[PDB]
Amino acid sequence: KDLFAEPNLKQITVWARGVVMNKDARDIVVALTEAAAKEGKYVQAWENYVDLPDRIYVPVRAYARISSDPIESKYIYENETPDIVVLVEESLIKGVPILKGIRPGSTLVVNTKRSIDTILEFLGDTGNLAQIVTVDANSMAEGIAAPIAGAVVKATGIVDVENLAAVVKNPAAMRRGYAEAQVRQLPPAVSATELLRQMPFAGTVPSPVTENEGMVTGNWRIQRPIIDREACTECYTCWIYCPDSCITRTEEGPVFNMKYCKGCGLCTAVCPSGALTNVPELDFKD
Amino acid sequence: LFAEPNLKQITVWARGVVMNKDARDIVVALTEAAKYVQAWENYVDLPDRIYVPVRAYARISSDPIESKYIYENETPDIVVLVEESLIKGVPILKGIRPGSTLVVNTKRSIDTILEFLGDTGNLAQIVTVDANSMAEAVMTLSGAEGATDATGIGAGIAAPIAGAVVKATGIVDVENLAAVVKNPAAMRRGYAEAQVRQLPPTELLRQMPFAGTVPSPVTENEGMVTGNWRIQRPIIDREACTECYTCWIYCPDSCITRTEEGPVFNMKYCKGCGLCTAVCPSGALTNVPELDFKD
Amino acid sequence: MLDRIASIKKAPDEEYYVPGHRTCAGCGPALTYRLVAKAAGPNTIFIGPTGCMYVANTSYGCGPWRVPWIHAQITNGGAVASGIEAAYKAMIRKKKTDAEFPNIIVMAGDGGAVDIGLQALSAMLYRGHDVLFICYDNESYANTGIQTSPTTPYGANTTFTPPGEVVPEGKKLFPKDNPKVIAHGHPELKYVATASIGWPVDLMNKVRKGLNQEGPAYIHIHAPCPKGWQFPADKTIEMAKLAVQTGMFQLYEYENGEYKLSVKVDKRKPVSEYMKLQKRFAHLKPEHIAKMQAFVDARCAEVGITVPVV
Amino acid sequence: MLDRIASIKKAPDEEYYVPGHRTCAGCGPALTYRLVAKAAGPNTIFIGPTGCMYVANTSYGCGPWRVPWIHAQITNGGAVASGIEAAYKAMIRKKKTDAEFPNIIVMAGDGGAVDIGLQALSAMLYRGHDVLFICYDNESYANTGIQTSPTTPYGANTTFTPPGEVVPEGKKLFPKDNPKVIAHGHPELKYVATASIGWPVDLMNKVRKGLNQEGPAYIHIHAPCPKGWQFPADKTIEMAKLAVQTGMFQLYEYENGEYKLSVKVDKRKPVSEYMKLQKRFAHLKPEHIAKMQAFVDARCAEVGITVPVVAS
Amino acid sequence: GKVRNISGCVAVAHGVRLADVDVICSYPIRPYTGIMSELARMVADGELDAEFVHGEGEHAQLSVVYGASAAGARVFTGSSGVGVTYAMEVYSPISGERLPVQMAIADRTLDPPGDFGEEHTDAECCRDQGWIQGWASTPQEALDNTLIYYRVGEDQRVLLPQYACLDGYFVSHILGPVDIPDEAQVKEFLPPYKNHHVLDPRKPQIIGPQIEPAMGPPLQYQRYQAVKGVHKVLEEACDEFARIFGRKYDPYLDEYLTDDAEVIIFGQGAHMETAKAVARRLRNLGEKVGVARLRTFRPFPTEQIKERLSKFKAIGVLDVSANFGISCSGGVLLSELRAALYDYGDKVKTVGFVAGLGGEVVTHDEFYRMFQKLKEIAKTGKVEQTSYWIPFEL
Amino acid sequence: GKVRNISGCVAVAHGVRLADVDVICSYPIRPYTGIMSELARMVADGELDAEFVHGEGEHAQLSVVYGASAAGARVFTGSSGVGVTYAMEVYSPISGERLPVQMAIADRTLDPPGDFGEEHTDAECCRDQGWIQGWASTPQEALDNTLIYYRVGEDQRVLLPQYACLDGYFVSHILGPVDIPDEAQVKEFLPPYKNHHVLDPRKPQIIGPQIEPAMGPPLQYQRYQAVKGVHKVLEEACDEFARIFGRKYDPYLDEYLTDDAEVIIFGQGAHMETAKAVARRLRNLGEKVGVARLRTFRPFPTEQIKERLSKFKAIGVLDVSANFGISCSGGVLLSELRAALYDYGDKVKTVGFVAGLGGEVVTHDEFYRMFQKLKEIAKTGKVEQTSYWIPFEL
Ligand SMILES: Cc1ncc(C[n+]2csc(CCOP(=O)(O)OP(=O)(O)O)c2C)c(N)n1
Ligand code: SF4
Ligand code: SF4
Ligand code: SF4
Ligand SMILES: [Mg+2]
Ligand SMILES: [Mg+2]
């Protein structure tokens, strides 16, 4: 990586919820790359091919590469060492490795109404993260691409504001995100043998017994079903309709497994007693 | 540079399907009876059609055979006909070697047969046997495309015809051939009742059209003349014909043409299936042997 | 529009399936091809998947068809037909040809229509191409040396189903009814019919009826195989007529969800009087004939034959 | 023999489709798989032709099935199943195994059952293998990014059927009714059924009924796709119920030549009340909806749904 | 001459559009799906007038365009991975009946690995089917090869089907500057499709009869000579393409800094662009290394390689594929290059490099490690193993 | 061992019978059909207890035995010509899932030419699929290879499917003396089939899951190493076959009069029997000629050839196949032989001969003209063209 490094290349990783918010992650990246191309930068914009096919509420990604020099890392699927991490949905700070391989002097841009301090309770160790940015793009767009993109400029200054104001459909919401962004500065690979050893005979793996730990899907959750047991009739309509087998029938009633629950809200929608409520995930620490 | 003097070639012509099994069993019984032997059916004639001239070849040698992989016997020593009408319109005398023998299954006289053959060339002997009365023709779907025959070898008219071949050439012992056939008794008849008579002393690339694509015919397909399939031909009695043209609409080969004089039968392609005779409601059609005609 | 054929005498003289082909003597499918070509006319394109009516007709480097013809795989009879249809409708629309829309006919064997070409068949009916798909049925893979097929009758003798101590009937399976398979589920399918060479006029009319339709048509034709079914070369029409008169093959037109029987069977004969004339059933015991009959009874009920067996 | 399921309360708690798979939130086919595995039991072998229920469930290097499972091509669902059946009946007869004859179930997508896997399906029914062939129908090639299929409804929007001035409806072709295709012509076929995830007990019982048969069975299960049909992830079961209540999908059991309706629809809603909830039909004009309605009416006539449309 | 920043998938469709293709048969499989999706949109919006047939499978895809071409229409289809092997039966009849069917292949691994990434293995199975076959490394070239292979393949002295191949994801998805030509440029370049045989009731022909056993070799040798004459027509097309479209292509080899090179890396596809990026940097460090990208895989430029690549001490051959059991345990390119440079076998050292397996990126570092291995061979003149499976062996 | 004069079809069926195959899937195509007919008879007559599945096609055939192998049963199927290419998609998953499915191939030309004769072309399409592949030249060898390929392929160190190939008509139909082994001889030779994974409800496994993109190469490399280890097991099987059955086979090359030979003809199949008959005769004229018949096509004996065939002045390569567009315009064998003997490219001259097209017999006269050309090259040390298409060019 010494002979083929690119110091002029900035990597951007934009996390989003699959299907529902993939375009939002895309519009952020495209607007940024188009804005840098007006300054003469060499840019690339694309969606994570690895996350395909995209599923509903699955953590997906959209990457950006901006360089003053011709890009020689085009054929690389993912940005492995991001400089700017962007979240289109707030709950992505919970249970999703959005800080893996971040480079020094990096910035975290999050779309939320919660305080930065509360977010750090979900980030844990911030590592080499230099700055954190919070913007309420939900109210500004009322797309949310421009207010988030505007908040990125305020902290990194990758492209000029006027240049980005010429590529967005809503420049007004962008400037708000550029102005109301809350910035806080923070203090500053396996071998092929093992990669071969981790490959079982013909790819044949044993069947699970109780759960499939190869795919823990709790971090898909934007919202979680909350039960009111005094309103529960124990009809178990919810139990027979969960696509992810997250409900167990007990004497106390239906118990919801939060390790895999994707928060689709099916159980809530079909419940005739209204004993279930969809509540944002960031109201929970577990 | 590659000749084999100890190798005798045998070419056995037959009518497809009906006598394909019989012609094979003739060849197989002899090779099993003998030395170095080879027995197979003409792969070119496959799949066999009804009344189409097919072939079964044999090679028997005192020395190891080095010409096994050749599809056909190009220089036959023994020509065998299981069906009488095969002398008509079928190249059964191509490449025949000196000191050869012609074995024919028929009840007809030798003199009549010679009227269709013309010049016999290097043909030395001619043999006729009435295996029709001695045995019965056998057909089966088993033993096809290389499969084994569950009915065995030499079950029908194969052995009596094969026995007549032995009487003239003496290629194998009767008892050896009697141990591979299902009817040694009928074999003894064919070996004994056989009547033998001694006889008096680059371009292919240019011919390849574009991608093998050929233009559509207009009136006929001259690439496949099937008149020489006939063991029998339909003969009409026009005073019995109602000109209903029932025969015309049931001919698989479009050999009937509707004229003002009535149905005209095309003898160039007619396979003599006898359907027209069978489906004619007026009975104006009759199946008559092909060898009753000179044209 | 192809007019109805009143009779055998009033049938056209012009042949588009000329003399000269290496088919068996008294070949059922050969007559099938001849009658279809006769009813189709000059404005016809034939698609011939690999089988008897391809190999036997073209041996060697020739063909009996007076109209255009192309070889197809046994796997893509209808698939190729779909392409020829789409091409002409595109070449015409874009004014790249002055050619009139031709009759597009597939002559698929039972294996290439019921077994290995069924997938390419169903999808053509699904896309609703203006193509006439015909199955000539000799109830076996005939060209390969008579091997078992989904249309091969129960207890029939083939090289893949030989009778033995373990399998007394040879073929334990009852045949697949392809006409009933595709008659349902395809909204674009406008005309289905079953025909027999025993009834040449009815056959040609069904073909012309299918060609006249503003969509895909399918005609399942019964074509006796003397070589495969093991019977004399001059009894093919007797086998074709007997097959209907005994209930082994049903003649009808399934249109608009309702069956219309083609030939009037006052009394149907037992199957034994039909199977005894064929050496492919020569191994079956009276228990097998009964099972065949019970099956034929159930098969005849499906089309509307309520008359008892005489 | 798998006993009949009386109710949800009387439905088994045991799951054979555990949590942990990369399927969409509120995935219809995922629930289908969950219900099928629950009704099947431990003595079951699953065959998964390439599609969403293969890719999404096994991603990556894992799987949710407590029972044996093998990948098949999208082209050979029934062909592979036939092999597993033929193998077990032979290994048992020759005393080469003590294993009892298992439930052999194919979980094919609509493409893998109606389009590219149809031939391997029909031929399996012809050979009469003791196999349950199930088609979960999301009315598209979903895993490849939602492309048109023979079960994709008329005028539906896919990446292969986009609406434009030349083709305003996107898809001009009306869907193929595969259950009726295979219901005829196959003598060995003993049990056919159509099911929906809106009716879980009815769904599971039909599976158990098909498995209890000594031959080939086919069950076409309706499984709404939130990602493909473009509707909220929590409206999948409402969509399944609406599909039945509007006549888009018919629940029945065709046995011995007669259709037997599963659910009693006293009154049918117009097709608009089902298609308005899905953005794949969002391009259609009231005239296209009319062609759809006429088609659905005729579709209901074939099986015996004679009840009129309310407020049509 | 409008320049656009489009992916390979869209680029191919624009090439197909300008070709005025009459029949298109589709089916979904990544990453070629976008081609049919773009083609479906173009038809739906009236950008192209064409029959867009929904095939029931890939075997059907090639079957449709087979029959459509025989009816005299210009056709286009495509597939990927196991879609390529599913339609395997239809490939040979298409060439044998001389039907210039063009099939785009965005490469994808077979099963296994599965539906993720690319390998050339799928398209390399069709090596014998008698088609024109080559890889485009960039979206611009994918558009160009579409028109060219139509020009070369539909040439009446050739009349052969073509495999317009392009790397999965790396060419199909990644954006690139594409000069989309004008129709007058294409009208000037590509004449209407006309074969010697066609299905037409006005001029009846019998296409594909069962031929005589003795007529086997003449039919085989006829197509053989047709394959041999492809190269001459191809060269004329590249000279004509440069004249009309302003882009000069080499008919056989895309050579980059090979004049003074001591060792080179031979290969095809987009990964050679990466190889040029590694070669460029090593050239600036004073190391005489080069890269030779194969533009035409079929018919193989045997003598062209023998003439132009026989001046190097060592040649590394990259095979982004899994051709199991093959000689020298590398790939097809290794085997076919050694065959071409056989007379120089004692002098020109050759070694095979197998990478990019499962769709993995052949990284810059890996290309560096290849070039360094070549120097060891160039210094010693010896080859330990004929192939190295990266990154497990080198 | 009872000696009988049987065809290749019957010989193969007896090998299948002696292997006690549990599942058989069939389909008709010339000229391999006869195998299944005998197998159908053996089951019907109770000579073999096996499930005889009537496949709807070749794609299904390989698909059936795929699932059947996964259920732990020994399986058998087969095809020819376009039947081999129709089931093409299934080859990779079968090998990739390590299922030792054996498929007998009685070679037949594709379409075109058609339904007449044999070419190795059909089986040579499956060269990359990761199977065991080799040609039997005699009916006896066809029976022997069946048992050998089962033992080697089902070996837990191998676990790979096999292509038991044999020439169409020339081996399949042509009768030959076959020593049919005893059940005790085979039982000693061939133990029951046992794989590492199997579909069993008591011990559940997930066979063929979608793997991680990064796990692509290790899975490919895992099967790569498995292919490499085939030769060692093959040698052990040939040594063991000789001990039990009394016939000693060479694992890679059947050489005839090559010890002091100056020029040889390299190839595979039954036509090599014709070559052995011609070489002896020229030897009697004082001409030092030889024949080296390839017994194992896959995995290719690269190093074995480099060691044993590098002592000859000239080598003629007969390719009874039509691999169009390939390097040197010969066949696959020419390219893969030159690749193995690349290090000796300046000394050991090699030339390709393409004959037997359309199923034609490669006559003695044709082999004579090959042998004469080899002496001409050996005297001059020069090769005009790398291939000759007989009899149009030689
Ligand atoms: C022979 C073949 N062709 C194409 C593909 C590509 N492919 C992968 S998933 C998929 C979708 C399968 O569709 P469907 O059967 O409806 O199942 P679904 O994805 O909807 O669950 C396709 C076409 C393939 N794997 N194999
Ligand atoms: S659906 Fe509602 S009422 Fe019924 S069991 Fe679940 S929480 Fe209780
Ligand atoms: S086998 Fe049957 S269909 Fe074929 S040519 Fe002979 S009689 Fe006709
Ligand atoms: S695309 Fe449809 S079937 Fe596939 S996972 Fe998503 S919702 Fe389920
Ligand atoms: Mg047939
Ligand atoms: Mg689907």
PDB file of C-alpha atoms in Angstrom, chain B residues 133-213:
ATOM      1  CA  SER B 133     -40.660 -72.406 -45.076  1.00  0.00           C
ATOM      2  CA  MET B 134     -37.988 -73.700 -42.705  1.00  0.00           C
ATOM      3  CA  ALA B 135     -38.059 -70.859 -40.169  1.00  0.00           C
ATOM      4  CA  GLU B 136     -40.021 -67.712 -39.291  1.00  0.00           C
ATOM      5  CA  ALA B 137     -38.862 -64.079 -39.434  1.00  0.00           C
ATOM      6  CA  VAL B 138     -38.248 -62.543 -36.001  1.00  0.00           C
ATOM      7  CA  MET B 139     -38.656 -58.919 -34.884  1.00  0.00           C
ATOM      8  CA  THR B 140     -37.966 -57.293 -31.508  1.00  0.00           C
ATOM      9  CA  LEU B 141     -37.279 -53.927 -29.889  1.00  0.00           C
ATOM     10  CA  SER B 142     -34.591 -55.508 -27.719  1.00  0.00           C
ATOM     11  CA  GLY B 143     -30.982 -55.872 -28.859  1.00  0.00           C
ATOM     12  CA  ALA B 144     -31.006 -52.399 -30.387  1.00  0.00           C
ATOM     13  CA  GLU B 145     -28.239 -49.796 -30.727  1.00  0.00           C
ATOM     14  CA  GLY B 146     -25.777 -52.224 -29.149  1.00  0.00           C
ATOM     15  CA  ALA B 147     -28.066 -53.787 -26.556  1.00  0.00           C
ATOM     16  CA  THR B 148     -28.047 -57.540 -25.961  1.00  0.00           C
ATOM     17  CA  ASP B 149     -30.760 -59.677 -27.554  1.00  0.00           C
ATOM     18  CA  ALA B 150     -32.985 -61.399 -24.986  1.00  0.00           C
ATOM     19  CA  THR B 151     -34.381 -63.641 -27.728  1.00  0.00           C
ATOM     20  CA  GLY B 152     -30.874 -64.917 -28.429  1.00  0.00           C
ATOM     21  CA  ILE B 153     -29.019 -65.601 -31.665  1.00  0.00           C
ATOM     22  CA  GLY B 154     -30.208 -67.603 -34.675  1.00  0.00           C
ATOM     23  CA  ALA B 155     -33.801 -67.877 -33.502  1.00  0.00           C
ATOM     24  CA  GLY B 156     -35.627 -67.389 -36.784  1.00  0.00           C
ATOM     25  CA  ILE B 157     -34.674 -67.435 -40.455  1.00  0.00           C
ATOM     26  CA  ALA B 158     -31.122 -66.464 -39.541  1.00  0.00           C
ATOM     27  CA  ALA B 159     -29.746 -69.996 -39.113  1.00  0.00           C
ATOM     28  CA  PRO B 160     -31.314 -71.587 -42.204  1.00  0.00           C
ATOM     29  CA  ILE B 161     -29.937 -68.761 -44.372  1.00  0.00           C
ATOM     30  CA  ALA B 162     -26.577 -68.811 -42.585  1.00  0.00           C
ATOM     31  CA  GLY B 163     -26.374 -72.571 -43.066  1.00  0.00           C
ATOM     32  CA  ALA B 164     -26.736 -72.152 -46.818  1.00  0.00           C
ATOM     33  CA  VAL B 165     -23.739 -69.821 -46.760  1.00  0.00           C
ATOM     34  CA  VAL B 166     -21.644 -72.476 -45.029  1.00  0.00           C
ATOM     35  CA  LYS B 167     -22.439 -75.075 -47.699  1.00  0.00           C
ATOM     36  CA  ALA B 168     -20.650 -73.021 -50.373  1.00  0.00           C
ATOM     37  CA  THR B 169     -17.709 -71.485 -48.492  1.00  0.00           C
ATOM     38  CA  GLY B 170     -17.190 -73.768 -45.495  1.00  0.00           C
ATOM     39  CA  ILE B 171     -16.014 -70.885 -43.323  1.00  0.00           C
ATOM     40  CA  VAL B 172     -17.142 -72.555 -40.079  1.00  0.00           C
ATOM     41  CA  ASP B 173     -18.263 -75.998 -38.921  1.00  0.00           C
ATOM     42  CA  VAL B 174     -21.999 -76.692 -38.747  1.00  0.00           C
ATOM     43  CA  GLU B 175     -21.810 -77.933 -35.148  1.00  0.00           C
ATOM     44  CA  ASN B 176     -20.033 -74.740 -34.101  1.00  0.00           C
ATOM     45  CA  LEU B 177     -22.757 -72.700 -35.778  1.00  0.00           C
ATOM     46  CA  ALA B 178     -25.353 -75.061 -34.315  1.00  0.00           C
ATOM     47  CA  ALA B 179     -24.116 -74.127 -30.842  1.00  0.00           C
ATOM     48  CA  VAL B 180     -24.796 -70.413 -31.263  1.00  0.00           C
ATOM     49  CA  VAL B 181     -28.207 -70.621 -32.959  1.00  0.00           C
ATOM     50  CA  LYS B 182     -31.617 -71.144 -31.357  1.00  0.00           C
ATOM     51  CA  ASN B 183     -32.677 -73.539 -34.104  1.00  0.00           C
ATOM     52  CA  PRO B 184     -29.982 -76.019 -35.043  1.00  0.00           C
ATOM     53  CA  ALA B 185     -32.710 -78.095 -36.732  1.00  0.00           C
ATOM     54  CA  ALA B 186     -33.737 -75.359 -39.192  1.00  0.00           C
ATOM     55  CA  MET B 187     -30.033 -74.732 -39.725  1.00  0.00           C
ATOM     56  CA  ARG B 188     -29.518 -78.331 -40.832  1.00  0.00           C
ATOM     57  CA  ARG B 189     -32.258 -77.800 -43.403  1.00  0.00           C
ATOM     58  CA  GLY B 190     -30.679 -74.636 -44.774  1.00  0.00           C
ATOM     59  CA  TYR B 191     -27.276 -76.301 -44.840  1.00  0.00           C
ATOM     60  CA  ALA B 192     -28.687 -79.307 -46.695  1.00  0.00           C
ATOM     61  CA  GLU B 193     -31.396 -77.845 -48.935  1.00  0.00           C
ATOM     62  CA  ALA B 194     -29.188 -75.027 -50.230  1.00  0.00           C
ATOM     63  CA  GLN B 195     -29.004 -75.031 -54.033  1.00  0.00           C
ATOM     64  CA  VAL B 196     -25.495 -74.054 -55.129  1.00  0.00           C
ATOM     65  CA  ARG B 197     -24.569 -73.170 -58.716  1.00  0.00           C
ATOM     66  CA  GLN B 198     -21.080 -72.312 -59.962  1.00  0.00           C
ATOM     67  CA  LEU B 199     -20.848 -69.274 -62.232  1.00  0.00           C
ATOM     68  CA  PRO B 200     -18.851 -68.888 -65.483  1.00  0.00           C
ATOM     69  CA  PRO B 201     -15.417 -67.157 -65.388  1.00  0.00           C
ATOM     70  CA  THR B 202     -11.475 -31.079 -51.777  1.00  0.00           C
ATOM     71  CA  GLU B 203     -14.334 -32.076 -54.087  1.00  0.00           C
ATOM     72  CA  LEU B 204     -16.456 -33.011 -51.077  1.00  0.00           C
ATOM     73  CA  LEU B 205     -15.737 -29.473 -49.913  1.00  0.00           C
ATOM     74  CA  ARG B 206     -16.904 -28.086 -53.253  1.00  0.00           C
ATOM     75  CA  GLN B 207     -19.966 -30.309 -52.918  1.00  0.00           C
ATOM     76  CA  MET B 208     -20.642 -28.702 -49.539  1.00  0.00           C
ATOM     77  CA  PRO B 209     -23.118 -25.781 -49.800  1.00  0.00           C
ATOM     78  CA  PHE B 210     -23.206 -22.744 -47.487  1.00  0.00           C
ATOM     79  CA  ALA B 211     -23.627 -24.078 -43.935  1.00  0.00           C
ATOM     80  CA  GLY B 212     -25.222 -27.206 -45.389  1.00  0.00           C
ATOM     81  CA  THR B 213     -28.263 -25.124 -46.316  1.00  0.00           C
TER      82      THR B 213
END
